[PDB]
């Protein structure tokens, strides 16, 4: 269709990976041609209507695969960024039809996409995060495979000691998934929370992805509040027995839990929690104590304490109160 033909031509043109190690002038020329070709199509697919036809889909997916599905160790990032931006605009288009795209965006594609999450470039991981989040939401028949494959990446790292650079981004995607769970939480999701999310707190590199991890845990509790006890107890279990600045994170996570905790569930764990909180106030590390003392500023926590002061106050101030 003339313009469809040119679109496909330019897409395929961006599948030629060149290098002139003996001609810097020709190399920059080719790079710019490719950069311009991508830029044109980015603008073209973004602002034009009804340009994504059925024959376009395999060309876009192939162009992405040829360019992105590479081996890791980039320097030629302005090229990769354009491919990411184009493919995202492709996925996000109002004319995008998953029923057509599901043929080319499959499990092998998703799996290869996930392998890129181990990239050391934060910019790339960010694009992959947005991309996979889009793919997950658009393709129902991949959600199960995606969940399991993310599960596998997590079941590694923790146990298999297979370090991963994209744990944060993946958890951020998961947080988006958890927030939209169906009313009775499937057992598979409960199993995941208790057997994967919680043990993630014991890993040494927790600092890198802790805010994302905490959000997932909190979101899990805003869904089914009955999961409060095994979470808090595990968090108290994975709590640093050595007084360390790492405690502030747990205190951040714990207060964020208390902000969404139900009173009936608060009672179940208020004693071991505040026994730990009391230790934090007594901490040799000022940062830890300062963070723990900030709990009293929370009005909802105060509500829970004031209506349970008979058992909590003797724990926080044993010299001033008794049972």
């Amino acid at each position: 269709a003339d313009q469809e033909k040119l679109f496909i031509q330019k897409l395929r043109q961006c599948c030629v990976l060149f290098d002139f190690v003996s001609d810097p002038l020709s190399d920059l020329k080719w790079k710019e041609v490719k950069r311009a070709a991508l830029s044109e199509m980015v603008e073209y697919i973004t602002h034009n209507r009804n340009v994504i036809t059925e024959p376009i889909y395999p060309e876009v997916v192939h162009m992405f695969a040829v360019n992105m599905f590479r081996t890791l160790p980039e320097a030629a990032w302005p090229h990769l960024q354009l491919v990411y931006e184009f493919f995202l605009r492709f996925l996000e288009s109002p004319d995008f039809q998953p029923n057509i795209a599901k043929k080319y965006i499959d499990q092998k594609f998703v799996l290869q996409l996930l392998e890129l999450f181990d990239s050391e470039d934060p910019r790339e991981r960010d694009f992959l995060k947005t991309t996979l989040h889009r793919i997950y939401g658009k393709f129902l028949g991949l959600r199960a495979y995606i969940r399991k494959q993310i599960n596998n990446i997590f079941y590694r790292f923790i146990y298999e000691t297979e370090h991963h650079n994209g744990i944060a981004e993946l958890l951020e995607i998961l947080g988006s998934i958890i927030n939209g769970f169906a009313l009775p939480l499937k057992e598979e999701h409960k199993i995941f929370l208790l057997k994967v999310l919680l043990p993630l707190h014991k890993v040494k590199s927790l600092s890198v992805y802790h805010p994302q991890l905490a959000y997932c845990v909190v979101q899990f509790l805003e869904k089914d509040s009955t999961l409060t006890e095994p979470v808090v107890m595990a968090l108290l279990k994975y709590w640093p027995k050595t007084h360390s600045p790492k405690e502030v994170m747990f205190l951040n996570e714990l207060e964020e839990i208390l902000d969404v905790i139900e009173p009936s569930e608060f009672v179940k764990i208020m004693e071991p929690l505040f026994r730990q909180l009391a230790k934090c106030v007594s901490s040799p590390h000022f940062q830890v104590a300062e963070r723990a003392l900030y709990y009293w500023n929370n009005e909802y926590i105060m509500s829970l304490i004031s209506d349970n002061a008979a058992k909590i106050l003797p724990i926080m101030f044993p010299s001033l109160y008794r049972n």
């Binding site: 947005t130 939401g137 129902l140 959600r143 988006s176 939209g180 769970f181």
Partner: peptide, 8 residues
Amino acid sequence: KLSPIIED
């Protein structure tokens, strides 16, 4: 922040 994804 990523937009929520309703489960099916």
